[PDB]
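Handover notes (outgoing to incoming on-call)

Open items:
1. Cutinase 2: sequence verified, structure written out, both below. Nothing else pending on this one.
2. Nothing else urgent.
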Amino acid sequence: ANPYERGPNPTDALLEARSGPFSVSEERASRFGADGFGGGTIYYPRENNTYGAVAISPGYTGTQASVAWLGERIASHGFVVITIDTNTTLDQPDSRARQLNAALDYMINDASSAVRSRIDSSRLAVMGHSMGGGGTLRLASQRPDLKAAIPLTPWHLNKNWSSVRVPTLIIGADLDTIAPVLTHARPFYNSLPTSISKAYLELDGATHFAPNIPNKIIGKYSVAWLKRFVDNDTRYTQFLCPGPRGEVEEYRSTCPFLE
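Cutinase 2 structure tokens:
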């Protein structure tokens, strides 16, 4: 059996809802305790079990409030999730990568016992919006031990992610004028090795700010991705594969993934 499975067998309805099955509590990571990032909010399942841990970075000029809906929603499906503030709102993608790494360290080592006892420290992921999605790719390139990476409308001037070995779901926004898919999300996806578990989901009719606005599609595929890769949860494969190929412009992947 898979020891990491949580929650009921998924349905489209379970994945599309405002909340997953797990009620969530919050812990502050204050700017005083947070070494190497600007603090954040830890969302954790109340149910006493161990779960994967996820760190989520906002973009340039962004704060944790721009990704909070998504951190809380992901946690509610059985994840310990920290939504971070960066050292400064102007921090660059490679700085956001070090801050994401600091936030994973924070949750594992420095958060309270309620939080540390609910984390399986061997099962980690990172996500991020825009420059925070660039930082997601950078940290994934540096940390093959990460179970999953989800760059959301990512922005990075480095276009070559051929070193990334972490299962990566890139979410692009077709009408993105800030991190245009032609120069960011698509080249990033294309440059990921053909041999890893990866997917590219391009939202239809979506601006750069789609990740900042509660969105059933982003929620559904973010959760499915983390469930598949953080939890090794093959109950979720059928949502990812062959995938949504009306409100998804494009979906490509290396489905079916190796198990």
